[PDB]
Structure formats: structure tokens, C-alpha cells
Amino acid sequence: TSVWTKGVTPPANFTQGEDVFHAPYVANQGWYDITKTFNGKDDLLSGAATAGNMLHWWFDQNKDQIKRYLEEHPEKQKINFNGEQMFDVKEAIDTKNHQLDSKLFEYFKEKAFPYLKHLGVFPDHVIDMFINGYRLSLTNHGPTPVKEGSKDPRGGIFDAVFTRGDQSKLLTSRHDFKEKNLKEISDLIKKELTEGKALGLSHTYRINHVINLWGADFDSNGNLKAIYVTDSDSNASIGMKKYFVGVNSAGKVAISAKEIKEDNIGAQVLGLFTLSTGQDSWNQTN
Secondary structure (H helix, E strand, O other): OEEEOOOOOOOOOOEEOOOOEEEOOOOOOOOOOOOOOOOOOOOOOHHHHHHHHHHHHHHHHOHHHHHHHHHHOHHHOEEEEOOEEEEEHHHHHHOOOOOOOOHHHHHHHHHHOOOOOOOOOOHHHHHHHHHHOOOOOOOOOOOOOOOOOOOOOOOOOOOOOOOOOOHHHOOEEEEEOOOOOHHHHHHHHHHHHHOOOEEEEEEOOOOOEEEEEEEEEEOOOOOEEEEEEEOOOOOOOOOEEEEEEEEOOOOOEEEEOOOOEOOEOOEEEEEEEEEOOOOOOOOOOO
């Protein structure tokens, strides 16, 4: 059985490479593959790249609503810092298909999180910041506090609708996997995918790396056999990668470009991040 993210067409151009079974990127298929250039600023930003890919998918899901929102709130289109333009969401939308130079990831690596040293930020926080304006704290290692507060100057583009402090307007979640088994992990991923959310996955590598999880294959018992992902560290020429999923010799659910076995323990999965469309939350009349 297979389950794919809402609005994402399964690639049909998979081929076995030297290290991985992969499908070269093809634009407008619903999925995204932001790719790092390791320019000193995006080197450890897999969390932000994964968030960027989720937001690009989100731009597609809410294309018309965003257009209407910007017509209602023209001042929200651009982010200006003391007279200087930092970001234009229309440019981000216009270049969303670009792997290496999308304007959203440019903003993330250049203005929002440049070098963030030997730190990194997770997808949920970045999205909560970008959309609702929730302040992103480098010292917060838990979920975003759902409380009222001032807007993070780096975001809050859509906060006239997706407010801070209102649970009905929070579009993300994070789930810890560390002490979960194959069935629990498989069940959650399937549920999140089936419910129409975009997924981000963290795994050991700061011993941490985040990737986009676009689809998954389950066996007859409902247990994951494989996942399809895009990884910001991979060359732009790679695209969607198929990863095997299996419990390794250390008793951990792990993923790898090759079968999980004694000689290939792979990477332990650590957590999951989700983004819902918020498609029924845009009406200003409620």
C-alpha cells in the first residue's frame, strides 16, 4: 500500500543510481526540492529548507486564498526592515519551483537565519514564524507556545488571519519518535499523510538532519517499508529519493538509501513535523 501527500503526483521517473533509487526533480508535480549551496549561511539549515519545501507546497494548496489575502492586506506582501526590503512573498511564490535559488530559501539563509553558529532551527518553528508571526526563540527546544504575543519581525505575513494564541489557527505540530516502535511511527505517518498534511522528518546524522517526507509504502501489516523524500543536502540532480525503513541492529527504526541490515544500520528517525493547509480558515467573516 502507498500513501502520498495531498496534491503530490508520485514520480514516474525513478532510476537506480550508484547510491540511491531516485527520481530527478520535475516542477509542478506538487513536491519541492530546495537544495543547499553550502555558501556558509545555509550549511546547517536543513530544518529551514524542509520548512521551505513545506511552505512551497502550502503556496500551491492556498494559491487563490493567498491572492485574496494579499488583495485585502497589501502591506503584508513585503517585509521591510528600517527602509530596506528584506522579502517579497510574491517573489517567493514566483520562484517556488527553483531548487537552488528560490526566493523563500534565499530569505531564510540570508535574512532570517544566516549561519544559525552550529545551531539549526526546526520546520514547525520556522513555519509558525513565517505564517503566524510566532517569535522564533533559539533557546526553545519544545513546541511553539500557543499564546498571544508580538509578531516576529521576520514573519507574520499571514497573521491577519492566522493569529497567535488561537489553537484553531496553528497549522503545525511536532511528534517525537525516539522512544516509539515501527507500528506507532508507521501509524502516525500514515495518519498525517491521509489527513492532508505535508510532512518533515528528522533523523540522526549535532547528530540531526531534517528532510521532507512526500510519500510512504506500507506492508500487509501496516508497517512502513519505505519512504520517498527530498533532502536539502542532496545534489539538485538527485530529486526524490526512496529510503528503506527498518528496525536496525540497535533496535531503532531507521532509514537508509539501501536495505537496513547488519552491515547497514542506517539513520534512526527522531521526529516528525507537519503542516496543514488551513484551507477552511481564511474567511475574515469566519
